[PDB]
Amino acid sequence: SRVFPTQRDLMAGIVSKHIAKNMVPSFIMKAHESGIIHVHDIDYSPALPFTNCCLVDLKGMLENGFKLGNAQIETPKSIGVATAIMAQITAQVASHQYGGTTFANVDKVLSPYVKRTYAKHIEDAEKWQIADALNYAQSKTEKDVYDAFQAYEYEVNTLFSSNGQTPFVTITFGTGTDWTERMIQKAILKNRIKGLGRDGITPIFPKLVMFVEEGVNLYKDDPNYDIKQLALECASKRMYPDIISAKNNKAITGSSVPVSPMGCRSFLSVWKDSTGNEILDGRNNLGVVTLNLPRIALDSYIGTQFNEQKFVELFNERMDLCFEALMCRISSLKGVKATVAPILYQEGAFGVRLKPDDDIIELFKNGRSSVSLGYIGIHELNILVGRDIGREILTKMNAHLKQWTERTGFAFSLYSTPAENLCYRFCKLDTEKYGSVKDVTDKGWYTNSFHVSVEENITPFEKISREAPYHFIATGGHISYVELPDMKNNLKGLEAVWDYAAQHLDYFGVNMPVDKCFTCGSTHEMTPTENGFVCSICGETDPKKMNTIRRTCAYLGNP
Amino acid sequence: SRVFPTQRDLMAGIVSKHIAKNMVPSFIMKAHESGIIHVHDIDYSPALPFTNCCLVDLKGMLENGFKLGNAQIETPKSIGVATAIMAQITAQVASHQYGGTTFANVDKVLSPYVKRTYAKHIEDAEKWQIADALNYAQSKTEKDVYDAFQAYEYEVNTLFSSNGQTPFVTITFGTGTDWTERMIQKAILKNRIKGLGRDGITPIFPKLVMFVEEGVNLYKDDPNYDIKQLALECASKRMYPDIISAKNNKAITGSSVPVSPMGCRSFLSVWKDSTGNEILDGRNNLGVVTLNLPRIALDSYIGTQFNEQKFVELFNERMDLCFEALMCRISSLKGVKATVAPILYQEGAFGVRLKPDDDIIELFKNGRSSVSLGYIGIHELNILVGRDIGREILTKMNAHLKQWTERTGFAFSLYSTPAENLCYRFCKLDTEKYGSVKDVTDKGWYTNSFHVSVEENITPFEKISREAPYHFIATGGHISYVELPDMKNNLKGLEAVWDYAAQHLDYFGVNMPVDKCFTCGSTHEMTPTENGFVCSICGETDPKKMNTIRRTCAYLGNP
Ligand SMILES: Cc1cn([C@H]2C[C@H](O)[C@@H](COP(=O)(O)OP(=O)(O)OP(=O)(O)O)O2)c(=O)[nH]c1=O
Ligand SMILES: Cc1cn([C@H]2C[C@H](O)[C@@H](COP(=O)(O)OP(=O)(O)OP(=O)(O)O)O2)c(=O)[nH]c1=O
Ligand SMILES: Cc1cn([C@H]2C[C@H](O)[C@@H](COP(=O)(O)OP(=O)(O)OP(=O)(O)O)O2)c(=O)[nH]c1=O
Ligand SMILES: Cc1cn([C@H]2C[C@H](O)[C@@H](COP(=O)(O)OP(=O)(O)OP(=O)(O)O)O2)c(=O)[nH]c1=O
Ligand SMILES: [Fe+2]
Numbered sequence A, B: 001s002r003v004f005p006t007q008r009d010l011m012a013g014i015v016s017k018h019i020a021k022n023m024v025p026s027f028i029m030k031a032h033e034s035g036i037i038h039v040h041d042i043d044y045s046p047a048l049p050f051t052n053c054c055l056v057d058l059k060g061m062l063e064n065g066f067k068l069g070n071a072q073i074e075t076p077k078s079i080g081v082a083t084a085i086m087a088q089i090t091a092q093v094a095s096h097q098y099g100g101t102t103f104a105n106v107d108k109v110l111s112p113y114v115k116r117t118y119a120k121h122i123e124d125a126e127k128w129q130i131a132d133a134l135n136y137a138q139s140k141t142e143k144d145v146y147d148a149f150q151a152y153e154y155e156v157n158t159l160f161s162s163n164g165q166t167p168f169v170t171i172t173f174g175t176g177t178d179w180t181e182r183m184i185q186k187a188i189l190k191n192r193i194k195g196l197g198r199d200g201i202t203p204i205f206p207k208l209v210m211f212v213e214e215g216v217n218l219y220k221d222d223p224n225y226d227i228k229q230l231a232l233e234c235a236s237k238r239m240y241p242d243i244i245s246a247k248n249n250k251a252i253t254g255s256s257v258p259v260s261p262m263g264c265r266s267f268l269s270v271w272k273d274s275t276g277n278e279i280l281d282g283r284n285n286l287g288v289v290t291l292n293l294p295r296i297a298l299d300s301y302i303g304t305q306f307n308e309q310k311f312v313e314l315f316n317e318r319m320d321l322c323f324e325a326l327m328c329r330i331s332s333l334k335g336v337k338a339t340v341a342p343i344l345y346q347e348g349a350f351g352v353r354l355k356p357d358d359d360i361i362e363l364f365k366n367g368r369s370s371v372s373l374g375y376i377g378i379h380e381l382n383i384l385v386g387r388d389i390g391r392e393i394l395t396k397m398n399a400h401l402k403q404w405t406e407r408t409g410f411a412f413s414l415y416s417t418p419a420e421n422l423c424y425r426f427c428k429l430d431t432e433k434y435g436s437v438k439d440v441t442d443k444g445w446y447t448n449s450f451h452v453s454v455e456e457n458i459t460p461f462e463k464i465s466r467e468a469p470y471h472f473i474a475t476g477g478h479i480s481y482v483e484l485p486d487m488k489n490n491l492k493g494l495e496a497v498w499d500y501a502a503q504h505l506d507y508f509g510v511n512m513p514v515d516k517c518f519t520c521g522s523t524h525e526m527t528p529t530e531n532g533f534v535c536s537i538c539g540e541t542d543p544k545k546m547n548t549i550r551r552t553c554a555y556l557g558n559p
């Protein structure tokens, strides 16, 4: 885009790419340059000591106070101000890390402030002699909460003035049963269903993730079952939320509490502070280097046949390569001070408080921060090698990772790279060397991690059942998608899929069509044309006259 | 600063400086490089087609609606949402122009929404059977307005996450007499006096400018005289507001309405649209090129004496040079589309609505946009040439400018460059050539435009009387400062200066000391030390334990 903020960002990205070339060892760059591996965010790191994604310690920032500039902010006295502060923090964090930023359990964290808002409306009843003191406060408070999250949504939408790579913001909830916590959840979902602007279009951020759990909102008789239903409506109208099986999530992370994803789908593993406490909020990831799997197999061919021996040599060889690549950037952090990003290291953001001249690297050591080793297209890999080695190779990988972790003290993990673009980059480069290869590089892209090919036709239950096991292997990051027709009226159908998913896997999301004709008002699925979309019951063809959203890869977008 | 956002910005600035070198004619760069002239914002323009400062057409955006992303925003339904939208717009504009952004007459523009807030609190009275229906709404409404501007202040303070050169935001008011308009003004001033954070520190933005006018808030019996008093308190506690004599301002601008400054002190001249309407909000400036005056005189010396003849040759010579410099960047805009910055050209920002593929340059033609020709240090110039040629040379300049305007259709104007840094740059370069020169380059800087030297000791009335005439010559931009001791208790004294200023000149501001000891709580003037500030009644010496603000040059800062 020819928008100033974007233009400016590209300049800094070009200088950063160049600088990266003078910091990263030649053998690593060459590998990245040829498509064997992919050093993510090379346009940010290692030119500058940025970190990746994270879970913001909002709970700790609002309770203890923190500086935002020279201004010493104090605990919010109302829900509205709490979300306003949240938005303000979102802007800070977004400017100090190249990865996405997440606010986990906003329903449990903001809860206190929904109470303070109620408190006030009560005193206001015992001051103007309000009739239904209680029925009054419940009304106003309920509204306050609504406006607060509607304000948050526009704050985040405005942060597309930064365009220093769209601010990926994620917000999770669901594990709250109290009225306040319930009000927050509903407030969030109601705002989302409504949409943005007078045409109630579908927002692309902040991402929504709701935790489902037996005895909370899973079964018809659970306290928050009404929420689940609302959530179903939202997902059919707005695409999000996505759902996380608290059950499996906890098993995978080994955490006593559901673990929200940092950004799109990066998951931390349970960790404890010097006095034995399980800490989640405030933690982050250090970077991502993705291994091009199909390409390992392609390089293992001799003539037109696969050679198992060569494969193991290149695998072992490239595995060490990736380690080297990751350790290359973790080391660029050696020596940089907290003066580099105050909200993150000095105020509450990363859950601690460093002195300006403290080194930021010590904070990530000993398993606190996760480090990502990504991969892509097991599907194309299976084709290339004959059998299905998905689960097996991903396991051989975890093995390597464990040694890395034991040799460095850094929590290395298996991450299922969203690869929104890399899906193309890898294929293009591989094609420059092998050209069109049936089933592998012919379509022009590699399928995502362990996802079943976007072509293969299988029932949704067959699909979420085929991918489910990977969620327990690639602990660092994973998600499972399923394609469904309009379900706005068939919510039970959707609830069927959610339920089955919640049971077998961890991070689940179901993408279906979400269009709205601005002229005729139809929300039925548009009709695909060589020249764009056309409304079935209206004929509208002008793109400026409709809101057509689809989750092709990792995010929501308009084709 | 080693803060990521700043680091990133510098990268884009370095690429822009480099690019500028391949776009700007060699003779112009050489001149800029040697200190004869100064091409402002060379780190933004002309690498990218950015414009400078502006007056945002908030009134037009809120009334007619506009897009912020793909979201079609509608007229606010409350004051809180109006200021929230304002903040959101501030973020957009700030990211699409390198200059400061101003919101003129927020008291008259936001007024409608203060009414809608009242309206609602009334219906709420006729719904819960509120006792003092009116005394209730007046209470809540009055509070709503307060919170809205307190929210705005933190929004702007947070925009120091952009650090793509601190967002200079300016807000003006004063010309409003209605209750709503009055509530806004007071709300603004009350929030400012309070301060930011738990230590109520003095904010550096948004800048505050209040219009004073006979029969409004000038004399003891004017409707808003109580506001003026509050304003006096604020100025003594928080430094701002600054004041503008509506009387002189209108005479200078030739505008039927007080003309607020774009950013720090850029002033537009009256202009009309094709159907004869005086338009102010939505207009902007195209750039700034400053002429180094002392240096013209220095280059005019032969041996140790000034040579009048050489002076006129270099003056005429450099005048054309500056024109060339300004016309060089105005031409870089030739051909760029509105796709470059939607809030500015496509939505309401610049007061019109262009089609994506429309050229942005046509909008500034025929006097709509102002173009700045700056100057600096007439004081040092007077010394160098013997007599006082301040008023005379500034007039010979306007003459040149008028021909430029008649030859190009661009509204060229005489701008008194804030020169927050240039005051040093020019002196340093001039010194590389002439070294220490008594009274001129010895102290290490040149005084600002027509300002009486910061050393010369003269009564404030003598000073505002000596500088007053320049306000009517350098129409494009001007301001007059005066130094005063703590006046927090001597407000009448301050009001004395304001009154005299309001009478004789246009844009006036009085800077005095504004410190606060965090430990002892004292707000008396701190004591200067070779090692920093020390509290008189407390002894505190830790900088992290106090808020010491001073307006050394153009902005507020902590030495
Ligand atoms: C309004 C606002 C306040 N703050 C800060 C400032 C304070 O130190 C702290 C407390 O906010 P509040 O006390 O909630 O601010 P308020 O004046 O709107 O509410 P009340 O009248 O009930 O006091 O939060 C922000 O950080 N961002 C904001 O947008
Ligand atoms: C892979 C790739 C990325 N990019 C850009 C896009 C991003 O703004 C930036 C960051 O690099 P990546 O993180 O490599 O981009 P990605 O989208 O492949 O990674 P992911 O989807 O897993 O987040 O680089 C390209 O321009 N071309 C490419 O081929
Ligand atoms: C809250 C908010 C709304 N808007 C937009 C969205 C709408 O199109 C328009 C109108 O806002 P409002 O109608 O004032 O939004 P609200 O729902 O908080 O108030 P009410 O319950 O009285 O309706 O402003 C923003 O641009 N930024 C914001 O922060
Ligand atoms: C003059 C000068 C500016 N700059 C920087 C500061 C600004 O962020 C940026 C913009 O250039 P200028 O606009 O030239 O900076 P200035 O402060 O001299 O201009 P003014 O006070 O009138 O606004 O360049 C320097 O780093 N060194 C200098 O000597
Ligand atoms: Fe239609």
Ligand SMILES: [Fe+2]
Pocket (backbone or CB within 6 Å): B517, B519, B520, B521, B522, B535, B536, B537, B538, B539, B540
């Ligand atoms: Fe003190």
Ligand SMILES: [Mg+2]
Pocket (backbone or CB within 6 Å): A077
């Ligand atoms: Mg408060």
Ligand SMILES: [Mg+2]
Pocket (backbone or CB within 6 Å): B077
């Ligand atoms: Mg509304």
